[PDB]
Write a protein that binds this ligand. Sequence first.
Ligand SMILES: [Mg+2]
Ligand SMILES: [Mg+2]
Ligand SMILES: [Mg+2]
Ligand SMILES: [Mg+2]
Ligand SMILES: [Mg+2]
Ligand SMILES: [Mg+2]
Ligand SMILES: [Mg+2]
Ligand SMILES: [Mg+2]
Ligand SMILES: [Mg+2]
Ligand SMILES: [Mg+2]
Ligand SMILES: [Mg+2]
Ligand SMILES: [Mg+2]
Ligand SMILES: [Mg+2]
Ligand SMILES: [Mg+2]
Ligand SMILES: [Mg+2]
Ligand SMILES: [Mg+2]
Ligand SMILES: [Mg+2]
Ligand SMILES: [Mg+2]
Ligand SMILES: [Mg+2]
Ligand SMILES: [Mg+2]
Lengths: 232, 266, 155
Amino acid sequence: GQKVNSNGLRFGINKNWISRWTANSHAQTAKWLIEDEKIRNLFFVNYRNAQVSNVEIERTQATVDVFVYAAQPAFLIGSENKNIQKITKQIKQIIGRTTNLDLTINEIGSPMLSARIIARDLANAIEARVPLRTAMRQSLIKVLKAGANGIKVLVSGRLNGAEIARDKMYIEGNMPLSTLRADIDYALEKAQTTYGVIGVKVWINRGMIYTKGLNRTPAHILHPQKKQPNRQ
Amino acid sequence: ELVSLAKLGEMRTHVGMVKRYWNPKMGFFIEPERKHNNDHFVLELQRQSLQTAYNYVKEVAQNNGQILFVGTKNDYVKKLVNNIAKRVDVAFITQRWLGGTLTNFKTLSISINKLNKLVEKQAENAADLTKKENLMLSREIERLEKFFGGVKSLKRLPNLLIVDDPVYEKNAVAEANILRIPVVALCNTNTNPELVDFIIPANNHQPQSTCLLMNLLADAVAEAKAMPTMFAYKPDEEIQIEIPQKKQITSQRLNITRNPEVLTRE
Amino acid sequence: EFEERIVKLKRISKTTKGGRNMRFSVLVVVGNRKGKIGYGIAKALEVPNAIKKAIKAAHNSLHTIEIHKGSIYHEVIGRSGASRVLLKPAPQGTGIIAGGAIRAIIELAGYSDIYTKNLGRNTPINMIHATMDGILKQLSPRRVAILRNKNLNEL
RNA sequence: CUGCCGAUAAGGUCUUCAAAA
RNA sequence: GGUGCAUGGUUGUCGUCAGCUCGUGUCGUGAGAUGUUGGGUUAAGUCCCGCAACGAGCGCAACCCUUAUCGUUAGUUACA
RNA sequence: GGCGAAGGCGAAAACUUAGGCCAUUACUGACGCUUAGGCUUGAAAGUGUGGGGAGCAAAUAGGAUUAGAUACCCUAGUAGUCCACACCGUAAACGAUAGAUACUAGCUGUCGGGGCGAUCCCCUCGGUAGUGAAGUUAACACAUUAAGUAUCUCGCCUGG
RNA sequence: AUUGGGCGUAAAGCAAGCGCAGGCGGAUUGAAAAGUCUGGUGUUAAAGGCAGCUGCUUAACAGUUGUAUGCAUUGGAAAC
Ligand SMILES: [Mg+2]
Ligand SMILES: [Mg+2]
Ligand SMILES: [Mg+2]
Ligand SMILES: [Mg+2]
Ligand SMILES: [Mg+2]
Ligand SMILES: [Mg+2]
Ligand SMILES: [Mg+2]
Ligand SMILES: [Mg+2]
Ligand SMILES: [Mg+2]
Ligand SMILES: [Mg+2]
Ligand SMILES: [Mg+2]
Ligand SMILES: [Mg+2]
Ligand SMILES: [Mg+2]
Ligand SMILES: [Mg+2]
Ligand SMILES: [Mg+2]
Ligand SMILES: [Mg+2]
Ligand SMILES: [Mg+2]
Ligand SMILES: [Mg+2]
Ligand SMILES: [Mg+2]
Ligand SMILES: [Mg+2]
């Protein structure tokens, strides 16, 4: 049957919001809401070879702050800070010159156990004509070796160019979806294949959060260092 | 010598089961029949078979083999195997023989490893256990001890099996045979001789014959391990044993009325 | 170097309360080409896992094979169900004149020259059963000497 | 505790594959 | 604009019913069986026993919110 | 449970009559097994002639039920079911397993003859059943009364 | 399906019996020698068959030498 979004079921209890701002009026609540979606989509659609895991947005009456986590930030940084200037101009055109931006790339730790880049890698493999069975298994084994709990991958679509759509799942371990205390990270991606669209869904279990609180604490960014800059 | 022929006769180790219950393939050990109604045995064959089994188990225990004792029959036998376990550090399975205790040893190895880890955790103790959780962990310890308390010691498949009754332990003897592991048993006229290797013609229903023979195999192990013997190489006064409670003792198989025709008709 | 070759890949299925549970079954023959050969049939939801389990089962049950001058010593008929496979000694040069599941077994065992004919069914499992049964009932010309008290095959 | 209780147009998907990692 | 009978995504339904499977092992030439069926207890494949089965995953349950009593902090724009 | 080769045989008696089991220091001395063709028997229904007919009931009439009911239900009801003599020669006529011969673990019943002598129970020789390993089978299953290891002879089968 | 198949549940044991001709058939001794085995001789036309060689540029082909099968007669063997 149908299931409630795993990310959406855990918001406001154990998971913080990706955008944290309070608008002035119901007219300014819509502009500030579509614009941040454009920024997030920009980061995700293009600049994909970087493995951007999550982009957070922080806005005040007039000051915009962006916290961008990536696995390989060299591509964003570019050759002696070139590509970086380009993206700043991109961000300024979307929000406006009248405001103040404080974009912040922040390098990420433990990149494997994140459902976003795994789905992106999965989608790239399917688009690259890689056999589906082999592609998921290599991603599954590497993620488990990274030192996490069970992972559930559902890859539904016109499998292998077939005319009848199927779906292949591969769970390997305890994925307690009905439990609220668990840390389940979820992401979904659309692999654009020449024979249509492939939907990949990745459920990852990253332990149990036994410390009550609406997070305010990082998630799989702590193990190695996490810095770099571009801020003020 | 090992034992005395009069002692075997007085312990009733030369008396099998009612002639109605016998496998025709066990005719070698049952001397020509007569007016006895419990199928008697040849005492010379008894001693010869016992000596051969004694020699082999001694060789294994001297060369540091791992022998496993499996008796999951009458209560007496259970207490007997526990007493033998106290005397010699041989692994034992007194409760029901789990399916694949030997052939699928990996899974039961995981279970006994879990048992040991839980035991040391409880021994190391913590105030986090409180009352409810402490009782749950204690009860878990009891269950994995009741069914793995004698199997915890060994870490690899045993090199020898001692079975009280091959008929009752058909699962155990089958596992030993498929894995090609020696198994000795006290056949009691109703057993297939092919499955067992070192056959020891004997009784199985008398709480005296069983104990005498079971201690005798244990006695070989104890001498190989260099601890003093209990019944073997011993005179009359020290072999004497008592008949458990609860004229002559009656080794008759009855209760036939509890075998009607399989429900049929239409 | 225990080589392995699939001899059949059937597509078995059971029926549940709506739909059909489909599992692949593989019949692998493993042989070192020196006298050791086994067979293993396994079922799994996917071909790779089925092949792994079948090879594991096949390697668990390995029988010992004796060769005489590269061929089979005496003509023998292996029976298994309704499948009867005839094996006949061959002179050095004919090659393996076998075909199908029997041919796979003979090559994987080590035998070279061998005359075969399948006189019964064409089900791969029973033909392999019959072939292995025929090869396992074979009598060496040294065992009969110990038995019949002859002179190590001497006339 | 035995009333009564009849029918259901044709042809059709769906397993691609283990070579292997 | 056509094709939800090419799909992705989302949803109704059996049904918040208590189920659906896998790994290893064993039986069967084989589809397959075992566990998951027996006896008790529940809303529950919830649990305990028995048991050629031993374990595991998803579901079930609890962790989440709210209402029902009380303690503590705070006393305005409530109370007074 | 018994008998007969099968169909079949169950109130009592008389007459005639068939086969069978057990023990044989008796006798003949291979005279034995199978059987194309041939002959005999062969459930029930059906036929021909003459009797018989209480009950029951194909066909038939009516009342119900039913969308319809030439059927299931009910009330009547002829042939028939019965006997004697003549035919018909078919049945799931089945143990769905032709007959004969020798061998191959065992256990539990039951029937008959013989040996002992209260029965009961023990042994021997046979008939009829259940369970059961090697063995056979595609599996179910058969398993000393074989569908097992073999021989002889007859009958029969060759996709729907 | 002589070599080389089957008839309980898949095609196939006649409904059963009395049974002539036919097929098969206990043990031992003697003779004969119809089957059975073996030796000698005759014959089974030539081409073709298989082996070797030669000749055509090698081959296809042609020639060349070898190569059985059965029947009859005669001389022995005596296990069935
Ligand atoms: Mg249904
Ligand atoms: Mg009605
Ligand atoms: Mg649809
Ligand atoms: Mg069970
Ligand atoms: Mg259970
Ligand atoms: Mg009649
Ligand atoms: Mg009318
Ligand atoms: Mg009437
Ligand atoms: Mg009439
Ligand atoms: Mg007929
Ligand atoms: Mg039976
Ligand atoms: Mg035709
Ligand atoms: Mg046929
Ligand atoms: Mg038929
Ligand atoms: Mg008949
Ligand atoms: Mg018939
Ligand atoms: Mg006759
Ligand atoms: Mg005659
Ligand atoms: Mg000629
Ligand atoms: Mg020519």
